[PDB]
Design a protein around this ligand. Structure first.
Ligand code: EZQ
Length: 289
């Protein structure tokens, strides 16, 4: 099937749905997202607006083409490689400290870039970071802007108001404590969620993971309470203190504070050097012969 002028649509990749495609003109694989012109939640075109505003950033997927063909709204992106969730599963849910610290450095920088563009992500989780392919295989990219929201006025840098009593939109496992309290998400929240993702990679799971409950709202209750009853020093026991210092600093941030991204990268960098590691982008999965 013929999309745009120059894109050939292949079978599904996974996840509307995601498809393998070919830029017939340039001889390069691409990824395509189709959305029916009928949906009770039209998303792609709004999501595509945000991807367009991120273009040019390190580790932002390049938009090849946006448009409509037949029944569908269409976005085409350069092809990327497997997610951190997919690589974590492929590695038996065990990452070395070096890998976690290599990831952490880049992941902080992606989040910082998104914030520089007046947005917060609000779905920071392993699925929403992808490694590149080929010459870009040492590069962590970030995806999925379907839950993203402006946190400040583009022009007047006016932060959004402190709001309360909200529903949890996102992934409960990585949500901030303040998110569980029903407080408006801001820059601090994206970083705290990263903090939990990093401890996830260290541990293989999180302690509030796989709690049984009769219903959904009950499960979220249990996750919230488990998080709020697990001290940071307990979550992080047996791992370098930096992971605790990182989360404590995130939990200390005020609603409208600009995070010291630099401080957080330096934290992991100092530990990196103390362990005698080198920023040669050799991740655990690069050593599978
Ligand atoms: F225009 C778009 C918008 C979003 C996607 C996408 N959504 C999720 N993924 C990751 C995924 C998909 C299916 N199974 C596992 C992981 C992609 C995606 C996949 C591969 N390479 C890509 N490069 C840019 C996005 C993307 C794809 C095209």
């Amino acid at each position: 099937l013929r999309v745009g002028n120059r894109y050939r649509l292949g079978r599904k990749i996974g996840s509307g749905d995601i498809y393998l495609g070919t830029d017939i003109a340039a001889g390069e694989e691409v990824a395509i997202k189709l959305e029916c012109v009928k949906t009770k939640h039209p998303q792609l075109h709004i999501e595509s607006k945000i991807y367009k505003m991120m273009q040019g950033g390190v580790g932002i997927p390049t938009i090849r083409w946006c448009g409509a063909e037949g029944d569908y709204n269409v976005m085409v992106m350069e092809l990327l490689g497997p997610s951190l969730e997919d690589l974590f599963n492929f590695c038996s849910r065990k990452f070395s400290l070096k890998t976690v610290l290599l990831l952490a450095d880049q992941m902080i920088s992606r989040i910082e870039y998104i914030h520089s563009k007046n947005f917060i992500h609000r779905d920071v989780k392993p699925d929403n970071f992808l490694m590149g392919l080929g010459k870009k295989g040492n590069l962590v990219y970030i995806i999925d802007f379907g839950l993203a929201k402006k946190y400040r006025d583009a022009r007047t840098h006016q932060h959004i108001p402190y709001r309360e009593n909200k529903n949890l939109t996102g992934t409960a496992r990585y949500a901030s404590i303040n998110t569980h309290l029903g407080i408006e998400q801001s820059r601090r929240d994206d970083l705290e969620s990263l903090g939990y993702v990093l401890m996830y990679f260290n541990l293989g799971s999180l302690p509030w993971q796989g709690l049984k409950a009769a219903t959904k709202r009950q499960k979220y209750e249990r996750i919230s309470e488990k998080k709020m009853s697990t001290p940071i020093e307990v979550l992080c026991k047996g791992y370098p203190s930096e992971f605790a210092t990182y989360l404590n600093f995130c939990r200390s941030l005020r609603f409208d504070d600009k995070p010291d991204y630099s401080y957080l990268r330096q934290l992991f960098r100092n530990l990196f050097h103390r362990q005698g590691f080198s920023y040669d982008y050799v991740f655990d999965w690069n050593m599978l012969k």
